[PDB]
Amino acid sequence: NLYFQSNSQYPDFAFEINQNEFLAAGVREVHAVVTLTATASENVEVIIIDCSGSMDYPRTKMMAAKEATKVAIDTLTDGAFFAVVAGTEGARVVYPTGGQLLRADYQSRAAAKEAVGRLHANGGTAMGRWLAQAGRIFDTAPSAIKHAILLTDGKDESETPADLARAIQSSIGNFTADCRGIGEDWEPKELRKIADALLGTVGIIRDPATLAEDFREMTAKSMGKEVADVALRLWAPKGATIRYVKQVSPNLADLSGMRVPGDNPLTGDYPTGAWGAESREYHICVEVEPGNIGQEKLAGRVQLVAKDAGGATLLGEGKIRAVWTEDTDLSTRINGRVAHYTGQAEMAAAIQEGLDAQAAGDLDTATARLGRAMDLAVESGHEDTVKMLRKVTEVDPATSKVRAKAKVDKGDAMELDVVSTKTVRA
Only segment of 48-56, 175-183, 232-240, 287-295 that touches Na ion (CB under 5 A): 48-56
- Show the CA angle centred on residue 2, arms to residues 306 and 229, nearest 5°: 10
What is the sign, positive or negative, of the torsion defined by CA atoms of 255, 49, 278, 81?
Answer: positive
Question: Of 45-53, 90-98, 234-242, 318-326, which part binds Na ion (CB under 5 A)?
Answer: 45-53
Based on CB atoms, which residue is closest to Na ion, 52 or 313? 52
Q: Which is nearer to Na ion, 96 or 183 (CB)?
A: 183
Which of 52-60, 137-145, 264-272, 385-393 is the region at the interface with Na ion (rule: CB under 5 A)?
52-60
Does position 247 bind Na ion by CB under 5 A? no
Taking the complex as a whole, the smallest distance from the CB of residue 113 to Na ion amounts, in Å, to 23
Asked whether position 54 contacts Na ion by CB under 5 A, the answer is: yes
Q: Does 52 bind Na ion (CB under 5 A)?
A: yes
Residues in the chain: 426
Residue placing its CB nearer to Na ion in the complex, 3 or 57: 57
- Judged on CB neighbours under 10 Å (0-12, 13-18, 19+), 259 is middle
The residue type of 304 is L
DSSP 93: E
Bridge-based pairing of strands 176-182 and 145-152 is parallel
Residue 187 vs 287, nearer CB to Na ion: 187
148: left (phi over 0), alpha (psi -120 to 50) or beta: beta
Instruction: Please return the burial class of 335, using the count of CB atoms within 10 Å of its CB with bins 0-12, 13-18 and 19+.
Output: middle
CB of residue 184 vs Na ion: minimum separation in angstroms? 12
Which residues, 6+ apart, have CB-to-CB distance to 292 below 8 Å? 324
How many residues at the interface with Na ion, by CB under 5 A? 4
154 or 343: CB nearest Na ion = 154
Minimum CB distance to Na ion, residue 418 (Å):
17
Nearest CB to Na ion, comparing residues 183 and 268:
183
Quick one: 187 or 346, whose CB is closer to Na ion?
Answer: 187
Shortest reach from residue 425's CB to Na ion, in Å: 36
Scan residues 253-312 and list those touching Na ion (CB under 5 A).
none
Q: Would you count residue 123 as binding Na ion (CB under 5 A)?
A: no
Residues linked to residue 319 through DSSP beta bridges, in sequence order: 301
Contact 316, 382 (CB under 8 A): no
- Least distance in Å: CB of 210 to Na ion? 19
3-state secondary structure of 277: coil
Q: Does 20 bind Na ion (CB under 5 A)?
A: no
Distance CA(376)–CA(424), nearest Å, equals 11
Question: Shortest Cβ contact with Na ion: which residue?
Answer: 154
Output the CA torsion sign for 62, 66, 71, 72: positive
d(CA 216, CA 194): 21
Provide the minimum distance between the beta carbon of 248 and Na ion in the complex, in angstroms, as a whole number. 33
Q: Is the peptide bond before 11 cis (omega within 30 degrees of 0)?
A: no
Closest to Na ion by CB, 11 vs 154, is 154
Q: Taking CB under 5 A as the criterion, which residues in 132-161 touch Na ion?
A: 153-154
Minimum gap (Å) between residue 127 Cβ and Na ion? 10
Report, in Å, the least distance between residue 313 CB and Na ion: 43
314 in Cβ contact with 3 (< 8 Å): yes
Nearest to 199 by CA among 216, 222, 182, 215: 222
Only segment of 53-61, 113-121, 171-179, 342-350 that touches Na ion (CB under 5 A): 53-61
* Cα separation, 294 vs 379, whole angstroms: 35
Contact residues for Na ion, defined by CB under 5 A: 52, 54, 153-154
